[PDB]
Every structure is written in C-alpha cells, then in structure tokens.
Structure 1
Amino acid sequence: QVLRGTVTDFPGFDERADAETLRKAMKGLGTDEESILTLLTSRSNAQRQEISAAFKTLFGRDLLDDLKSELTGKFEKLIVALMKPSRLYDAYELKHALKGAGTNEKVLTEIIASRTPEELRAIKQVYEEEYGSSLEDDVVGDTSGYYQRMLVVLLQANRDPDAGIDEAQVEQDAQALFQAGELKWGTDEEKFITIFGTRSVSHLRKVFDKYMTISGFQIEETIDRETSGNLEQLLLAVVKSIRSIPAYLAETLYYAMKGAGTDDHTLIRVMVSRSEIDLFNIRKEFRKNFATSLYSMIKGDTSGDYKKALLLLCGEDDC
C-alpha cells in the first residue's frame, strides 16, 4: 500500500569507514571498481553525501573529482549520477535538457509529467536556487506550441485534490476529451490541457474509463507513440502517469533498451532518480507489461562494471 524503491539506508552506517574503503579502492595506480560499485549502490543517497563529506575531512580530497578521473564511460556516468544529491537531480536534468534549439524534449516530458505536485514545487525552488532563473521561463524560452503551454500548466502544480467523485463531471470531461481527440488534438487546446493538467488523478482515471465506454477504444490509441509530435507525446505521458507513474516509467525503461542501441542516458536517469521512490513498483509493472524482467533486459543490453552496478540498483531479478 506504499511506493518503494530498491535502495535503503545501510544499517550500521559509518561514514568514516566507508570513506576509507573508497579511498583504499582508488589510492595508487590501480582501481577496485567492484568495491566502489558495491558500496555506493548499497548506501542511500543521503549516506553518499555524508561519505563525500567524511572523504574531504579525512583525506583533503574531493570524492567526486577522484571518481571522475578514476572511472570512465557509462560506469563513470552512472556513479556520478548516483552521487548527485537527490534534491538536485531533477532540476539538474531539466536544466541540462533545456538546450535552446537542441532541447531534449523527452527529458522535459518525462520529469514534468511523472512528478507529483509536491515534487514539482521542490524542483522549481531548487532550480531557481541553482541557476538563477525560473524553470518556467527557461521552458517557455526553449519550447513552442501548446507543448509549451501544457508543460507550463503542469509546472503550476495546481492539480485538484483527490476528493469526492462527480459522475456528472466525469461524463462531460470524457465527452470533451473524445472530441478533442476526434480533432486530432489540434483544436481547443487550452480546454483539454485544463482537463489533463488540473483535474484530480482519481477523477481522470474515471474520465479515462468513461472514454472507453463512449468511444470503444482507450484514449492512448488516439496518439501514435512513435510518430506523434511533442504535445501528443506529452499527453501520452500524462495519461500513462495518471494511470500509474511506475507503469509509465517502466515503459520508459523498456523503450530505452528495446531495439538497436541503448538509450543509456534514460536508463541511468530513471534507475537513479527512482531508486529510493518507486523502482520496486517500476520493476513489477515492467515484468507484467513486457513479459520479461528489468533485470534480464539490463543484463542483455549492458556490459562491464556499468552492468553490475545497474543490476545491483535493480536489486533482484523478477519472476
């Protein structure tokens, strides 16, 4: 009855002993990648921050700097991602995505659609603290269309509270959504944006069910997952996140490794950002919806120290 990650506080945690273990793993010309990945994936993010502090006090060096030069490639990127303070991770990912003409719209859609209003408020505050500009201003300056508008409405974090059901409002909203979809989501955008972005989660779940009975198909089938534009991809992410945030992020992981190549940025981002929130539930939705475990997918697509750290973050194989 609760969300659950795969990483928890290590019992009997001694930040000074862990700092010594990590320094022993890199002092000298050699490296003990196994010791580094085993310790860091078994300590919580808060514990990693205390290790980094004890590391600086004991040895007068910077742990993150040492890891960046001692490690390489995707393994380095994963370890560096795990060391980023949890409170800063999403704000950092969004700022990195906001790239003017080269903006990574997948990251904007992923984070803004799947984070709760509480999380988005914290992100907006942290974002201004770290970068001196508002997240909304950066998004507006770097996106266009009603994709921009829907992101702005979601960033407002003003979603209705899970209150009593209103079947009269569940009929009219579902009627409106059926009709915006009939017009290919290119008409009256502000109205379906207000429905997708401000109605309560429990309400929209009933609206999506009422959409089934009115239309004969689920609302997701009005949007092609591969060829649609940015707004449509955001609507799909919002719909799936309304149904289940773990299921949306599980599908995000699935398509990160499906087919030729691997989207390692998305793989690292989802496993790290959700490791202490709902990665266990993501694993369950993954096994149910794609007939194979997240563990087996990671094992088949990745290699080296990078793979073992990802498998330890995944925690277990699912059957």
Structure 2
Amino acid sequence: ASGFNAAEDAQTLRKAMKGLGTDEDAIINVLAYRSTAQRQEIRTAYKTTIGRDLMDDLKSELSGNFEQVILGMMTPTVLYDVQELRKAMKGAGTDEGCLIEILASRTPEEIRRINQTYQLQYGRSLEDDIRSDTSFMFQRVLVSLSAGGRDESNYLDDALMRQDAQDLYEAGEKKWGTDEVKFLTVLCSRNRNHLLHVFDEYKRIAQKDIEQSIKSETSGSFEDALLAIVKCMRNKSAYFAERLYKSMKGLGTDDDTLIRVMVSRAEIDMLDIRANFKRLYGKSLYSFIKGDTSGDYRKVLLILCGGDD
C-alpha cells in the first residue's frame, strides 16, 4: 500500500527486535531486499521514528556470522571498505588477502576516497598502517595501490607498451633472480587499456601468458597481489568468483572473506560472478554457499547470491 517507505521498514524492524527473542526472518525479509542506499534511509527513519540507533540495536540483538553479514549490509560502501582494511590490520596478525582483494579491485578514485576516510576515522594514514604491517616487495605494491595514482586515462602509448612487455619478459631472464620491481612498476602504474595491451605483447614475445610467468617467477603475498591486479584488469568478476571458491572449498570456511565479497559485490556484479563461478567450477555459487553454511546466516547469503544457476 505504498512503494519503498523507510519509515514503514523501520517499524517492521523495530517490531522484529521487540519482545523476547528476535524475528530474524522479518529482518532478512526487509534488509536483504533493499539497496545499500535504501538501508541508509532506513537507519535515518528508524532513529527519527523510534528515537534509537538501528546499528546499535542490531548489534545487541544479533550475533555471529549472521550479525556480521547484516551489519556489513547496513554499512555505507566507502566506510565498509575502510573498516575492512582496518580490521585486516588490527591485532597481531595481518589479513594480507583482504588488503590485496580491496586494493587491487577498487578504482584509483575509490581508493583515494578510502584513503581520506581512513585518515578521518582512525587518525593515521592507510599507508602508515600498511607500512607497519607488511614488508619488502608486497609492502611496496600495497603502498603504490593505496595511493591511487594509477593512470586513469585510456591512452595507449605504443612505444612504452612494447617496452613494458620487454621489461617484464627480461625480468624473468635475469641470472640472479626475478627483477620484481619491473612487475610492480608496470602492473601498478599503467592504465587498464595500456596494461591489457601490454599483456598481449608479452604473450607474443614470451609465448606464455603473464599469469603463468607471475606464478612461476614470484611467490608469497607479492605474487598474490600481482595476480589479483592482472585478474581484476582482465575479468574482475572471475577474480571474485575465485575468491569465493577459495573461502568455501575444503574443511571449514573463511567467513570473513565469504561475507565481505558477498556483501561488497551483491549490488555490483553478482550475476557475472555467478556465471564465472559455474564456468570455473562446474557448480553454482548458490549450491556452494548452501552446502558450506547454515542458519539465518546461510539464508541472507543465498539471497545476496540471487538464485541458483
């Protein structure tokens, strides 16, 4: 008896959190079927209408993975990335995979926004934290990416493109070892169109794909970062399909990654992620999530997925 009404959604959620226990299905039936933008209007309407803070109430009413997914869904796009990078770096351990996932997949523009926001939210620069929590070549790649200075044009410099391919090839022909800085320079600095052309040229002169050379010539998180960049440049949806596969295959589940990817990409390219997932693994993302998770947690996850393939 109306279209999208933030106030009405606010009432549904409040009712769901009232009384003994919590009607999580009511919560899902609303939030999982609203856009990130709409969820922000709901937060505003809830505080206006109820005089309480929606995020605080959700946190006090929910727990575990279900809580993590719902709160993630409720967080504005930029702030979610910022809070995920911070979480990746707090504590003794560092979630380098998360750092790579975010820094290799977001545009230089989105990264610049994440930068300023990181600074305002915590008081330190994203770069400083990266420098403190990572080292050597991997640190350098992240420092470059985090600054968001990658060429944003679509300009193709023929001469430079040919030289880049050569430098990359020669980098894997050095006696002492792989001239890793070359990979960093080319893969972190050039614009997409230029890089994609460089990959073709590389293939021509080396008779091998850049990805296979990266896998045999480099290792560790540095290797992962380069691969992430290449994959995100060529077929970003496939990169996330793989990310999701790795988080669910074999004993257990990397819930942090599973949740972040499903939440962050739900409104961006989930359909294409699903297509690539089935192509790569023969199974549908839906079937994988369904058999690797459970509870209301699984329910919201399957909905973010969108349906079986």
Which TM-score band applies after superposition, normalised by the shorter structure? Answer: over 0.9
Q: Is 2:125 the counterpart of 1:137?
A: no
Report sequence identity in percent.
Answer: 58
1: CA distance, partners of 2:12 / 2:294: 24
Instruction: With a CA cutoff of 8 Å and minimum separation of 6, indicate the structure with the bigger relative contact order.
Output: 1
Query: Given the alignment, which residue of 37, 48, 53 partners 1:46?
Result: 37
Counterpart of 1:25 in structure 2 is 16
Q: Is 2:92 the counterpart of 1:97?
A: no
Q: Is 2:159 the counterpart of 1:149?
A: no
Counterpart of 1:245 in structure 2 is 236
- 1:87 Cα deviation from its structure 2 partner: 2.3
- 1:119 Cα deviation from its structure 2 partner: 0.8
CA contact (8 A) 1:180 1:187 kept: yes
Give the letter for the 1:77 counterpart. Answer: Q
**Structure 2 CA distance for partners of 1:252 and 1:185, relative to 1, 3 Å:** farther
CA contact (8 A) 2:286 2:307 kept: yes
- 1:308 Cα deviation from its structure 2 partner: 1.0
Counterpart of 1:230 in structure 2 is 221
Number of paired residues?
Answer: 307
Structure 2: runs of 5+ lacking an equivalent: none
Larger CA deviation: 184-193 vs 201-210: 184-193
- 1:168 Cα deviation from its structure 2 partner: 3.4
Larger CA deviation: 200-209 vs 275-284: 275-284
Counterpart of 1:259 in structure 2 is 250
SS in 1 for 2:172: helix
**Structure 2 CA distance for partners of 1:181 and 1:248, relative to 1, 3 Å:** farther
Give the letter for the 1:306 counterpart. Answer: Y
TM-score (norm 1): 0.89
- 1:101 Cα deviation from its structure 2 partner: 4.3
2: CA distance, partners of 1:156 / 1:40: 34
Query: Given the alignment, which residue of 163, 176, 181 partners 2:154?
Result: 163
Q: Residues 73-92 of structure 1, C-alpha deviation per residue, up to 9 Å, x if partnerless? A: 21111111111122201111
Query: Given the alignment, which residue of 261, 267, 276 partners 1:276?
Result: 267
SS in 2 for 1:165: coil
Query: Given the alignment, which residue of 293, 296, 300 partners 1:302?
Result: 293
2: CA distance, partners of 1:238 / 1:161: 15
- 1:69 Cα deviation from its structure 2 partner: 2.6
Q: Residues 153-192 of structure 1, C-alpha deviation per residue, up to 9 Å, x if partnerless? A: 1122222244343443333211211222345995443332
**Structure 2 CA distance for partners of 1:22 and 1:128, relative to 1, 3 Å:** same
**Structure 2 CA distance for partners of 1:287 and 1:51, relative to 1, 3 Å:** same
CA contact (8 A) 1:184 1:222 kept: no
**Structure 2 CA distance for partners of 1:185 and 1:141, relative to 1, 3 Å:** farther
2: CA distance, partners of 1:284 / 1:185: 42
**Structure 2 CA distance for partners of 1:161 and 1:51, relative to 1, 3 Å:** closer
2: CA distance, partners of 1:93 / 1:247: 21
- 1:97 Cα deviation from its structure 2 partner: 0.9
1: CA distance, partners of 2:119 / 2:72: 21
Counterpart of 1:111 in structure 2 is 102
**Structure 2 CA distance for partners of 1:239 and 1:182, relative to 1, 3 Å:** farther
2: CA distance, partners of 1:233 / 1:247: 15
TM-score (norm 2): 0.92
Give the letter for the 2:267 counterpart. Answer: E
- 1:47 Cα deviation from its structure 2 partner: 1.4
Larger CA deviation: 31-40 vs 65-74: 65-74
SS in 2 for 1:217: coil
2: CA distance, partners of 1:27 / 1:184: 69
SS in 2 for 1:102: coil
